[PDB]
From a paper:
In order to probe whether these viruses are able to bind Neu5Ac in a similar manner, and whether differences in regions surrounding the binding site might contribute to subtle differences in receptor engagement, we investigated the structures and ligand binding properties of three representative animal viruses from this alignment: the mammalian ShPyV, which was found in commercial sheep meat, and two avian polyomaviruses infecting geese (GhPyV) and finches FiPyV. We expressed and purified assembly-incompetent VP1 pentamers from all three viruses by following the protocol established for HPyV12 and solved their crystal structures at high resolution. All three proteins fold into the familiar VP1 pentamer structure. Superpositions of the VP1 pentamers of ShPyV, GhPyV, and FiPyV with that of HPyV12 confirm that the core VP1 structure is highly conserved (RMSD values of 0.65 Å, 0.83 Å, and 0.73 Å, respectively). In HPyV12 VP1, the BC2 loop comprising the Neu5Ac-binding site is formed by amino acids T69 to Q83 (T73 to E87 in TSPyV VP1), whereas the putative binding sites in ShPyV VP1, GhPyV VP1, and FiPyV VP1 include amino acid residues T61 to Q75, T57 to E71, and T58 to E72, respectively. We calculated all-atom RMSD values with PyMOL using the BC2 loop of HPyV12 VP1 as a reference. With a value of 1.82 Å, the BC2 loop of FiPyV VP1 shows the largest deviation, while the BC2 loops of ShPyV and GhPyV VP1 yield lower deviations, of 0.77 Å and 0.84 Å, respectively.
Polyomaviruses are small double-stranded DNA (dsDNA) viruses with a circular genome of approximately 5,000 bp. All glycan-binding polyomaviruses analyzed to date engage oligosaccharide (glycan) structures featuring terminal sialic acids that in mammals are usually presented either on gangliosides, which are molecules composed of a glycosphingolipid, i.e., a ceramide and an oligosaccharide, or on glycoproteins, which contain mostly complex and branched oligosaccharides attached to amino acids during co- and posttranslational modification steps. These sialylated glycan structures interact with loop regions at the outer margin of the major capsid protein VP1, at the apical surface of the polyomavirus capsid, as revealed by X-ray crystallography and cryoelectron microscopy. The VP1 surface exhibits an astonishing plasticity, providing virus-specific interactions for a range of Neu5Ac linkage types and further specific characteristics of Neu5Ac-containing glycans.
Residue numbers in the entry:
A (entry chain AAA): 23 to 91, 98 to 291
B (entry chain BBB): 22 to 91, 96 to 291
C (entry chain CCC): 23 to 291
D (entry chain EEE): 22 to 291
E (entry chain DDD): 22 to 90, 96 to 291
Write the structure that this text describes.
């Protein structure tokens, strides 16, 4: 896109607020919303078939911007974003394996293990690279993936591309952001592994991310659409009988946009 | 929000207040375990989960009265900067008071001390902290003494836009049930750190040399409605483990130093 | 103190160097200097009486600065003002010792290195023109501290959190328990303090040392600590961790602290 | 050393290249365990130590051909591609959220819990230069007999367990210089920038970040980037994420591919 | 000390040296365990504590001869440096004869090097000035080591009498000697320590990091007798055999110093 001047005047700036609820695998408006189902493990790579509801998927939404029509596009210049409900992890009473399980004593162990925190702000869908731990994993039909993807899918294969077009069906473990594309998206990711890792979460309303590139240009919203994506896996919930499910948290978006003149 | 005009300069245009918030870990004031929760019990499942009063921490808050003031134009107090410290970090050097020993089998070694989660949040606002209700388990039956949303529904396990409140009382809002609402709180600044686990090493810092600016992007700080400065916090430091392995929350008090100035407004 | 003009030039700046040895509890000029006695633990909060030598105390010293004033009746006087400092934990090298009478990594097999010094880190220093102002605060109020220690007696349940009546000044070396006193943020206008706690009984000590790092001691107005009666007050506590013997007994280990303070002459009322 | 003169400015004075290096963790490409090493085996003593090919990881490298700039290579001065900045990301971090693919479970005794996922050492290094990455030979155990497929210094002295000034190399091929045997040589590499992090442990959880907003400047203290000789940009990296642990407790290295974006400008020289 | 006047800015006014220090973990040069200590034994008590020679590491040091050089003399002033720990790559070895993760099932990778980091380096115009300090003042150090004999109880903390200078390579025990902060006016020094026996080692390497050696008066270490003085200790962690015997492993350090001609006195 050929980028001309920032068009100033009244109603040249707009703010949107939005939230993505996590898609950890268990369904909406049932007792385990925000959790996955209990994780099963295969005996080998050949027979690996992870059941639906046992693994997280990316959350995404298209935010409709004020109607506009050289033309004007909305340009996203800055954002605030927050993981919400971090306060809930101070819960060590709700059906958790205890610190001293043998002695039937102590607090629950809380949420612990893997953390995966990622968000993207763009003017088109987030662009994805298929990459999996085990290529022979058979994903369920509810999921969007590349079927029979081959051994090369265990690392970077330039043919195995996609775009984040549906909320709660692109498995986190089978798709990542594509650094060969996403010129019109900003993406940010942090992974900390383990199964006994303590989660580390910060929250403040005073931190701003600038979305402008090296040329001072932000994501440009094609079709007057602003695209938000995340995954916010906090760790595992561990029950008394040692069963383990993913726990995730919702994510808050504030985005500021100004009118940009473009060819 | 409020239409903000010029900063008023002149004699006694600046004020400084100091305050503290004692923690509300669960056990009463004036009794032997003030600073602690009662011993934490754990339900078998989500469906019969009733955390009794005193076994969980609540938020601390206080309204500080500012000097009285007063047209198309009134003055308000504008919080421009602050200092805050967790106080009593020093007491965690205690490894002799009735603790699980690091070699309990052998009855030897120091106490294990306070270990486990840290939840450290504070808020400085010109009105009560606006809260988002969110719980690990929506079927948790909270006790009569706590302020919660009743029958929250399954969507309270994540974000649900209907489930709001305001931190209007000390020692009664369960930390596990309420968080700062990022869709509101334009007139409050809040800051928060969580580190999880149960045997996690606690890490506290303290110094009288650190200032946090409260001014937003347009250099407007929180403006104190009705001449009130609203201070909120929670300062879970970790868990205390008795000899017989029962575990309780331990908290510490927070100090606040807030510098305010007169601002002209509609 | 009405603060006026700084003095400039070559004669206007002085450096003092000092050290504080740790007060971990075992007496100086004995085999266990640097250490506490082996820690014992109470059965409950009520019968808690931590014996002398089994817990650390603050280190403190008043340094006497050049007396600047020939006459102290004049309308103004020179005061020393601390503008910058360097501080190092000394003896970090010693913690590479994994041979000296330490529970071994595989003690069941009587094999492997000593586990070395692990556990609680507590490192704070204060530089001020007057004693460090303290807030009394204890884990358990019913702990009866030994006669050798300076504490608030029968402090009450409120002393387990913030009580505004329970105040103090660090007025002596090796007697104010770390576990009962911390710096009071409601005071210390004339003092700068910094601390960090890292707990957890298996936690590895993390220590850095360099002669290249300065800490500026000027406040928001450009004013350093003003040394009242020509006194520079240095305070610290450096609990490195715990020494674990073969019989699983455990004592605090401390390290000494180096201080370099740069002072200039400040005119005052 | 090259005698460097003025920088060219304006639209045509800039070029950008995107590239990737896939890991060389030991197992062959186009087979079921590409991205992994073979199950690791451990020797009884230093003397008999002989790591089977596929069981240890090797460096990745590629030469990027840049547009040829000079019509007459006999000129007083000529143009050179000068690398001024890069972005690099580890790709496929996402896949580490897999705890169902045949991993030792956290409660193995009870056939319960998730997998333990990838755990343990991280070795993350990247290098960018106008000529191949220059290497120092240094090994844990000098008596290690490396297989024919690998490039090593043979019968290295006991001196090769520390710094020996004679034991030099160049990263001249992909997937054959073993990470455990070669490292960047700080006595050389004037024309390359390299960056590396080692995090040990066997239960150490991996910590990776990914963003398209992070730029590394490659200019030196005099404002000079790597100058690309024969119009070649050399990219080198190792990205050992940690170990995969099967049910039967056998462990292999898991690797991830690296993305490179390099911004270059025209520099006058000679 | 030295009264320093101006910087002679001319041609061949700036020089550069590169050097390495190999580590002195205890095992001799030109034998199979170069880079390691011998297997560490532990005393039963403080009063019967004698670390056998080779079981503990010593400081590395060397003097670099600089190009050779009245009411004012010229001196070499060190202005900037680079240092890297080398051979971090070797720590990806988990196959060389070490305790396995699952020793009871004879399975898994070697546990690799774990435990304590002690990384320091000093750059100066004279030998590094040392403070004696020991965990146990009653430890009996072998004849090969340079220590203060019968140091007394105050050597367990700071005693202003217990001074030394790092005058030799591989004989000053790390656990006995530290950089003296009451001296080293003409030396810059830098240390980090992480303790423990199972600690995950953390090492970074790059050739893009410069340290500025100048003081608050923009004066660098001045090289007396045209000698540049390098010192370090680089303990990475502990190597564990199948039989649970442990030894220190160290790594060599790279130095690059830029010096300029200073007029003095």
């Amino acid at each position: 896109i050929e980028v001309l001047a920032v068009r100033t005047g009244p109603d040249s700036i707009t703010e949107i607020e939005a939230y993505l609820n996590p898609r950890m695998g268990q369904p909406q408006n049932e007792d385990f919303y925000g959790f996955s189902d209990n994780v099963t493990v295969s005996d080998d790579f050949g027979s690996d078939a992870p059941p639906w509801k046992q693994f997280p998927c990316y959350s995404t939404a298209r935010i409709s911007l004020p109607m506009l029509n050289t033309i004007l596009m909305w340009e996203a210049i800055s954002c605030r974003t927050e993981v919400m409900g971090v306060n809930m992890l101070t819960n060590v009473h709700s059906a958790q394996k205890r610190v001293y399980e043998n002695d039937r004593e102590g607090t629950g162990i809380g949420v612990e293990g893997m953390g995966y925190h990622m968000f993207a702000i763009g003017g088109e869908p987030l662009e994805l690279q298929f990459m999996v731990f085990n290529h022979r994993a058979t994903y369920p039909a509810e999921a969007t993936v590349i079927k029979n993807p081959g051994a090369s899918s265990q690392v970077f294969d330039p043919n195995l591309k996609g775009t984040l077009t549906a909320d709660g069906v692109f498995p986190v473990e089978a798709w990542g952001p594509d650094p060969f594309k996403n010129e019109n998206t900003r993406y940010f990711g942090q992974y900390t592994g383990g199964t006994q890792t303590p989660p580390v979460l910060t929250f403040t309303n005073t931190q701003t991310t600038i979305l402008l590139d090296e040329n001072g240009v932000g994501p440009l919203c094609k079709g007057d659409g602003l695209f938000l994506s995340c995954a916010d896996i906090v760790g595992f919930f561990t029950q008394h009988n040692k069963k383990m499910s993913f726990r995730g948290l919702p994510r808050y978006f504030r985005v500021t946009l100004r009118k940009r003149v473009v060819k």
